[PDB]
């Protein structure tokens, strides 16, 4: 789906581009799970929000063309 957009957020995109300034810190607390893993902007562990708390997914190159909400699983009993 979704071939006419980069579908990244006006605050997650700004934060990862500002935190890619020559290498920076690691904390980025997002609430918007809908945004994708910013392609070629991987590396910084993002604290996604399944509702109960912020799970700190360390994003890797095997997870680049996915969304951030896959890594905040919203239920128990896997």
């Amino acid at each position: 789906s979704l071939k006419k957009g980069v579908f990244v957020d006006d605050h997650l995109l700004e934060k990862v581009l500002e935190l890619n300034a020559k290498g920076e810190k690691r904390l980025i607390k997002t609430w918007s799970r809908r945004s994708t893993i910013v392609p070629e902007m991987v590396g910084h562990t993002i604290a996604v929000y399944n509702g109960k708390q912020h799970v700190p997914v360390y994003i890797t190159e095997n997870m680049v063309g996915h969304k951030l909400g896959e890594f905040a699983p919203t239920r128990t009993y896997r």
């Binding site: 997914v57 360390y58 890797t60 095997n62 997870m63 909400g69 896959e70 890594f71 699983p73 896997r78």
Partner: protein, 120 residues
């Protein structure tokens, strides 16, 4: 005559006989028989061996199949079970993934109903 892997059909029409090769279904078997150029309704008990290899040169060289495909499907599954994407988890415990309800259904991703349940 075997085609790909070892998957040999006999005594059947060729344009569904190709379907027994994994990775070829009904649509690819419709397409890449007249695409090479074969009457797609010749029973493979009588298939000319020159036409068998003129078919096989399109079967193996074009798209990936049983083994090199099957293994990439399984590697996609193992890649999905990575740290915990939501589709690689629930492959990790076999539940369904693309929006299936599981309250009552999902007997083809679960089992054999383990009927250990029930109140008093």
């Amino acid at each position: 005559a075997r085609i790909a892997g070892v998957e040999i059909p006999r005594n059947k029409r060729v344009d569904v006989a190709l379907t027994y090769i994994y990775g070829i279904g009904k649509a690819r078997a419709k397409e890449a028989l007249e695409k090479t150029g074969i009457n797609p309704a010749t029973r493979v008990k009588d298939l000319t061996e020159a036409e068998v290899v003129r078919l096989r040169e399109y079967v193996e060289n074009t798209w990936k199949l049983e083994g090199e495909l099957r293994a990439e499907v399984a590697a996609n599954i193992k890649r999905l079970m990575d740290i915990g994407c939501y589709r690689g988890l629930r492959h990790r415990r076999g539940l369904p993934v693309r929006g299936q309800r599981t309250r009552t259904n999902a007997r083809t991703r679960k089992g054999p109903r383990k009927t250990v349940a029930g109140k008093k």
